[PDB]
Swiss-Prot record, chains A, B:
Belongs to the calycin superfamily. Fatty-acid binding protein (FABP) family. GO terms for biological process: epidermis development; fatty acid transport; vitamin A metabolic process. InterPro entries: Calycin, Fatty_acid-bd, ILBP, Lipocln_cytosolic_FA-bd_dom. CDD domains: CRBP2 (cd19463). The keyword Cytoplasm applies. This is Retinol-binding protein 2. The keyword Cytoplasm applies. It is found in: Cytoplasm. The lineage of its organism: Eukaryota, Metazoa, Chordata, Craniata, Vertebrata. Forms a beta-barrel structure that accommodates hydrophobic ligands in its interior. All-trans-retinol binds at K40, K108. GO terms for molecular function: fatty acid binding; molecular carrier activity; retinal binding; retinoid binding; retinol binding. Its main location: cytoplasm. It comes from Homo sapiens (Human).
Length: 133, 133
């Protein structure tokens, strides 16, 4: 049929690397994208189309209670075993992950309407700002 | 404020590559982890936290109209300007993208339940099969 609406999930994918190299796509995204399941959402009204193909890289679910340490396996990242503890520093949610790497943790606080997250490891600090949806 | 409830979407991510160098993450995972989309859903109840973070690769997101040609700019892919034209060949949605690369386009058709799409660039043909959810 001509109706292509719906949420589609990739069953198979052949010659993805060759097609991507034909487009001069670099090697790393070629290796990663071929391992991910693509989900193409298609919204069609007659001859007007809206195609959005997406891919889920990794999911990271963590459950914790403030002041109660827990055995956290940092899966979907570096996959290390750390004992994590989350505490309130005034209004900033601070988490210390005691394990192999030292000075490892994160600080997560709200400012106005934005979410500020600072991931800390040794002498490297990454800043991630989130907008509310 | 300590209320961090809600669904957040990342709009900035600086020094992710350094924080990832500290944790010894795989090379290509670092190279692709600098161009991905992150959504963090936070379910908070006083001090109990249920955090769910999803990393997401954007393969392609496009809107078009059948029979009307348009000037496409393929960011999230190879970042090239192409004159795209989408038509119906029977029940097969054919798309020709005229530009630098020759024989660039795709064919999208439905068979019973499955969605079949043949992307093609030059002499490279990529065939993808999708199942409706």
């Amino acid at each position: 049929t001509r109706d292509q609406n719906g949420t589609w999930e990739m069953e198979s994918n052949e010659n993805f690397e060759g097609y991507m190299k034909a487009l001069d796509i670099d090697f790393c995204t070629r290796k990663i994208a071929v391992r991910l399941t693509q989900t193409k959402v298609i919204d069609q009204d007659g001859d007007n189309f809206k195609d959005k193909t997406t891919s889920t890289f990794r999911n990271y679910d963590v459950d914790f209670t403030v002041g109660v340490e827990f055995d956290e396996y940092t899966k979907s990242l570096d996959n290390r075993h750390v004992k994590a503890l989350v505490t309130w520093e005034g209004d900033v949610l601070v988490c210390v992950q005691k394990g192999e790497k030292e000075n490892r943790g994160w600080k997560k606080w709200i400012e106005g309407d934005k979410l500020y997250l600072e991931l800390t490891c040794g002498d490297q600090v990454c800043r991630q700002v989130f907008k509310k949806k």
